[PDB]
UniProtKB/Swiss-Prot annotation, chain A:
It is found in: Cell membrane; Postsynaptic cell membrane; Late endosome; Lysosome. Coiled coil: none annotated. Phosphorylated on tyrosine residues. Component of N-methyl-D-aspartate (NMDA) receptors (NMDARs) that function as heterotetrameric, ligand-gated cation channels with high calcium permeability and voltage-dependent block by Mg(2+). Participates in synaptic plasticity for learning and memory formation by contributing to the long-term depression (LTD) of hippocampus membrane currents. Channel activation requires binding of the neurotransmitter L-glutamate to the GluN2 subunit, glycine or D-serine binding to the GluN1 subunit, plus membrane depolarization to eliminate channel inhibition by Mg(2+). The extracellular N-terminal domain (ATD/NTD) endows NMDARs with a unique capacity for allosteric modulation, harboring several binding sites for small molecule ligands that act as subunit-specific allosteric modulators of ion channel activity. A hydrophobic region that gives rise to the prediction of a transmembrane span does not cross the membrane, but is part of a discontinuously helical region that dips into the membrane and is probably part of the pore and of the selectivity filter. The chain holds residues 34 to 84 of 1482 of the full protein. This is Glutamate receptor ionotropic, NMDA 2B.
Curated annotation (Swiss-Prot), chain C:
It comes from the Eukaryota. The gene is Grin1. It is found in: Cell membrane; Postsynaptic cell membrane; Synaptic cell membrane; Postsynaptic density membrane. Glycans are attached at residue 1. This is Glutamate receptor ionotropic, NMDA 1. Component of N-methyl-D-aspartate (NMDA) receptors (NMDARs) that function as heterotetrameric, ligand-gated cation channels with high calcium permeability and voltage-dependent block by Mg(2+). NMDARs participate in synaptic plasticity for learning and memory formation by contributing to the long-term potentiation (LTP). Channel activation requires binding of the neurotransmitter L-glutamate to the GluN2 subunit, glycine or D-serine binding to the GluN1 subunit, plus membrane depolarization to eliminate channel inhibition by Mg(2+).
């Protein structure tokens, strides 16, 4: 369950990233991915680091 | 950098002083383009 | 034609228009009497004739 944190900002289709996110499931992987979904507004480096 | 924003930048700061890579400080100042002079580096 | 840098980090993307000018002043800056004596700067603004 390897974690990966996906992050977007602004107008974007989250359910599409979810779509392709579930679309790919392959035993070719020797480990299962742990899919995560995240979004944010501001570009300020500090708060970016924070989240 | 966290304490630079919260503690420092929030104070409407013209300059900062640094000693000891301390480089992150400059990263912050630079995203703010704010001149800062330390000592020891 | 002077301004002030932003207070809060959040939501502020605009660099302070005068910062570079302030820098150049720091470049031209020559202090005759310091505690350590005279202080100088190079092309990169670094202590010279130390
Ligand atoms: C992002 O911005 C929208 C509107 O611009 C706002 O409703 C939302 O609360 C913001 N996100 C956070 C985490 O505050
Ligand atoms: C910004 O500063 C310049 C330099 O002194 C001066 O022309 C004026 O204060 C401002 N610029 C304009 C076009 O008004």
């Amino acid at each position: 369950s390897i974690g990966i944190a996906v992050i977007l900002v602004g107008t974007s289709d989250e359910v599409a990233i979810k779509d392709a996110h579930e679309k790919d499931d392959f035993h070719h992987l020797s480990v299962v991915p742990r899919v995560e979904l995240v979004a944010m507004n501001e570009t300020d480096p500090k708060s970016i680091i924070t989240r | 950098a966290l304490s630079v924003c919260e503690d420092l930048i929030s104070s409407q700061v013209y300059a900062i002083l640094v000693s000891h890579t301390p480089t992150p400080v400059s990263y912050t100042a630079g995203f703010y383009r704010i001149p800062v002079l330390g000592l020891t580096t | 034609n002077i301004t002030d840098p932003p207070r809060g980090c959040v939501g502020n993307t605009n660099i302070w228009k005068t910062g570079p000018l302030f820098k150049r002043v720091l470049m031209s800056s020559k202090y005759a009497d310091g505690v350590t004596g005279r202080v100088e700067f190079n092309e990169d603004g670094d202590r010279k004739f130390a």
